[PDB]
């Protein structure tokens, strides 16, 4: 009962050549040809693609012993660190590591995060001056490396970003990893090794400093508005009693910071580009902002939580340009999928990119149209019609933080600046792990009157 196959052009390499040109177009073309589920061989991996919202239950509902996240990347050279994330000894242990991070994402902390957004943009606004042009993707990456770093690690990290080039070494954690790195065998990567070592030494020092801060001010552990992911990694332990090492704490922090940064900076870029390019969307965004802000001058938590239309704009950006283009699981046993059984050892693939352009879900899906959500509720037609943050067990735990961070940053930029996008909104570039717009993305800005 095998799903239909994409015919191998060559043995072993299989469909890799057309997949490598464009992974999203590959899944779109082969969906049209072969239906809601199909298999391709790609450099010796059996890849089974699930393409229609009506059949995604069997992917998202599975237990870790049926469809395995850990198995997809457990033989990967650890980008984050040994024994953390997909290198952890178990899925249960990975979920304890996820909890160390999610512990830092409370309402009490979200209230402080808004203050941190205002502070970082106020520094940035001074650099930008009264008017100019700025790369949108670079602006958003540079803002969120400061905001995400402070929100998750606390304000002691800032000195290392301003003075010790934590930013530079962080940008290389990623180095040479494209969405095709998964299929090529293990190469060397000394640049990445130098990055992780460098970030590791900075994170070791933050841990050492925070231990001394705990001894001087233990009442910190009672303050939900101060407790960050560093505090949680120093205070929490594994269920099974095995030691949480500083090696683990550093890898989990790098992995937390990577998650908290790339996806937010890219989504922020797409959302602002599309908002400022559409007269009616910009009108309603600024009307919402004007209503929420009243005669107040700065954001707080309750204001951001009201910004429903700016939230739809970001979810519309997430529909059209999801920064994670494939969600993958390893079949540890045969998986039923409609009339088919997907074989043991196949990797199942769900693509937010393909989900976002599904005409069964969304009308005129190449048009940025936030009202498709607020008015027509197109995201609600299917349970799995919108999956930019995934679903089930491994759903993003960062969703509310990402919404808070991107909505705040865009609200505050619109408060300071009139902004115009230079040229055509580009296509996504499928050349990085977290995919964002084709590089040249410039906008004009001018201080508002
Ligand atoms: C717009 C920004 C974001 C997008 C689009 C996004 C997307 C996703 C998606 C699709 C998944 C599911 C992956 C899978 O099923 O295999 C996921 C998982 C995850 N995300 Fe995010 N994410 C975002 C922001 C964040 C942030 C800001 C954090 C942390 C501060 C975060 C932490 C995580 C974690 C820990 C998981 C794994 C949960 C688990 O394995 O059980 N994400 N994210
Ligand atoms: O970072 C990855 N996934 C992201 C996706 N993300 C972002 C925001 N929300 C979810 C991710 C993440 F960065 C961190 C976490 C996480 C964070 C903290 C924890 F405690 C536990 C998990 C989860 C995640 F899912 C990731 C990293 C490496 C790879 C990978 N794919 N191929 C290679 C590879 C490397 C080399 C050669 C050959 C291949 O590496 C794939 C995905």
TrEMBL record:
<feature type="binding site">
    <location>
        <position position="329"/>
    </location>
    <ligand>
        <name>heme b 3</name>
    </ligand>
</feature>
<dbReference type="InterPro" id="IPR001128">
    <property type="entry name" value="Cyt_P450"/>
</dbReference>
<dbReference type="InterPro" id="IPR002403">
    <property type="entry name" value="Cyt_P450_E_grp-IV"/>
</dbReference>
<feature type="binding site">
    <location>
        <position position="50"/>
    </location>
    <ligand>
        <name>Ca(2+)</name>
    </ligand>
</feature>
<dbReference type="GO" id="GO:0020037">
    <property type="term" value="F:heme binding"/>
</dbReference>
<feature type="modified residue" description="Cysteine sulfenic acid (-SOH)">
    <location>
        <position position="358"/>
    </location>
</feature>
<keyword id="KW-0503">Monooxygenase</keyword>
<feature type="binding site">
    <location>
        <position position="73"/>
    </location>
    <ligand>
        <name>heme b 1</name>
    </ligand>
</feature>
<feature type="binding site" description="axial binding residue">
    <location>
        <position position="396"/>
    </location>
    <ligand>
        <name>heme</name>
    </ligand>
</feature>
<keyword id="KW-0408">Iron</keyword>
<dbReference type="Pfam" id="PF00067">
    <property type="entry name" value="p450"/>
</dbReference>
<dbReference type="GO" id="GO:0004497">
    <property type="term" value="F:monooxygenase activity"/>
</dbReference>
<protein>
    <submittedName>
        <fullName>CYP51, sterol 14alpha-demethylase</fullName>
    </submittedName>
</protein>
<feature type="binding site">
    <location>
        <position position="86"/>
    </location>
    <ligand>
        <name>heme b 1</name>
    </ligand>
</feature>
<feature type="binding site">
    <location>
        <position position="396"/>
    </location>
    <ligand>
        <name>heme b 3</name>
    </ligand>
</feature>
<keyword id="KW-0349">Heme</keyword>
<feature type="binding site">
    <location>
        <position position="394"/>
    </location>
    <ligand>
        <name>heme b 1</name>
    </ligand>
</feature>
<feature type="binding site">
    <location>
        <position position="394"/>
    </location>
    <ligand>
        <name>heme b 3</name>
    </ligand>
</feature>
<feature type="binding site">
    <location>
        <position position="396"/>
    </location>
    <ligand>
        <name>heme b 2</name>
    </ligand>
</feature>
<feature type="modified residue" description="Cysteine sulfenic acid (-SOH)">
    <location>
        <position position="337"/>
    </location>
</feature>
<feature type="binding site">
    <location>
        <position position="329"/>
    </location>
    <ligand>
        <name>heme b 2</name>
    </ligand>
</feature>
<feature type="binding site">
    <location>
        <position position="394"/>
    </location>
    <ligand>
        <name>heme b 2</name>
    </ligand>
</feature>
<dbReference type="InterPro" id="IPR017972">
    <property type="entry name" value="Cyt_P450_CS"/>
</dbReference>
<feature type="binding site">
    <location>
        <position position="396"/>
    </location>
    <ligand>
        <name>heme b 1</name>
    </ligand>
</feature>
<keyword id="KW-0560">Oxidoreductase</keyword>
<dbReference type="GO" id="GO:0016705">
    <property type="term" value="F:oxidoreductase activity, acting on paired donors, with incorporation or reduction of molecular oxygen"/>
</dbReference>
<dbReference type="InterPro" id="IPR036396">
    <property type="entry name" value="Cyt_P450_sf"/>
</dbReference>
<dbReference type="GO" id="GO:0005506">
    <property type="term" value="F:iron ion binding"/>
</dbReference>
<comment type="similarity">
    <text>Belongs to the cytochrome P450 family.</text>
</comment>
<keyword id="KW-0479">Metal-binding</keyword>
<keyword id="KW-0106">Calcium</keyword>
<feature type="binding site">
    <location>
        <position position="329"/>
    </location>
    <ligand>
        <name>heme b 1</name>
    </ligand>
</feature>
<dbReference type="InterPro" id="IPR050529">
    <property type="entry name" value="CYP450_sterol_14alpha_dmase"/>
</dbReference>
């Amino acid at each position: 009962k095998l799903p239909p196959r994409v015919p191998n052009l060559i043995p072993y390499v299989g469909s890799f050549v057309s997949f490598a040109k464009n992974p999203v177009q590959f899944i779109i073309d082969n969906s049209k040809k072969y239906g809601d589920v199909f298999t391709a061989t790609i450099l010796g991996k059996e890849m089974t693609f699930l393409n229609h919202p009506k059949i995604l239950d069997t992917f998202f509902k599975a237990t870790d012993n049926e469809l395995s996240l850990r198995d997809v990347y457990r033989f990967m050279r650890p980008v984050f660190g040994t024994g953390v994330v997909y290198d952890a000894d178990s899925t249960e242990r990975m979920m304890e590591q996820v909890k160390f991070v999610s512990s830092g994402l409370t309402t009490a902390r979200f209230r402080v995060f808004v203050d941190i957004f205002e502070d970082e943009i106020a520094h940035k606004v001074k650099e930008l001056g009264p008017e100019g042009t700025v790369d949108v993707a670079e602006l958003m990456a540079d803002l969120i490396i400061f905001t995400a770093s402070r929100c998750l690690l606390g304000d002691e990290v800032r000195q290392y970003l301003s003075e010790k080039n934590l930013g530079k070494l962080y940008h290389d954690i990623d180095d040479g990893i494209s969405p095709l790195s998964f299929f090529y065998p293990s190469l060397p990567a000394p640049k990445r090794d130098k990055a992780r070592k460098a970030v590791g030494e900075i994170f070791q020092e933050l841990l050492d400093k925070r231990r001394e801060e705990h001894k001087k001010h233990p009442e910190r552990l009672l303050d939900e508005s101060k407790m960050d992911v560093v505090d949680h990694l120093l205070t929490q332990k594994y269920k099974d009693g095995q030691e949480l090492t500083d090696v683990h704490r550093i890898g989990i922090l790098i992995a937390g910071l990577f998650a908290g940064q790339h996806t937010s900076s890219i989504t922020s870029s797409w959302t602002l580009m599309n908002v400022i390019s559409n007269k009616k969307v910009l009108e309603k965004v600024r009307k919402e902002q004007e209503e929420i802000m009243g005669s107040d001058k700065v954001l707080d938590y309750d204001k951001v939580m009201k910004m429903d239309y700016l939230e739809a704009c970001m979810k519309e950006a997430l529909r059209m340009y999801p920064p994670l283009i494939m969600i993958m699981r390893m079949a540890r046993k045969p998986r039923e999928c409609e009339q088919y059984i997907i074989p043991k050892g196949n990797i199942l693939v769900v693509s937010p990119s393909v989900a976002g352009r599904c005409t069964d879900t969304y009308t005129n899906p190449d048009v940025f149209d936030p009202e498709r959500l607020t008015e027509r509720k197109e995201h609600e037609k299917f349970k799995y019609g919108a999956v930019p943050f995934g679903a089930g067990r491994h759903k993003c735990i960062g969703e509310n933080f990402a919404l808070l961070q991107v909505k705040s940053i865009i609200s505050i930029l619109l408060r300071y600046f009139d902004m115009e996008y230079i040229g055509k909104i580009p296509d996504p570039s499928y050349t990085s792990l977290v995919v964002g717009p084709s590089p040249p993305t410039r906008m004009r800005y001018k201080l508002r009157k």
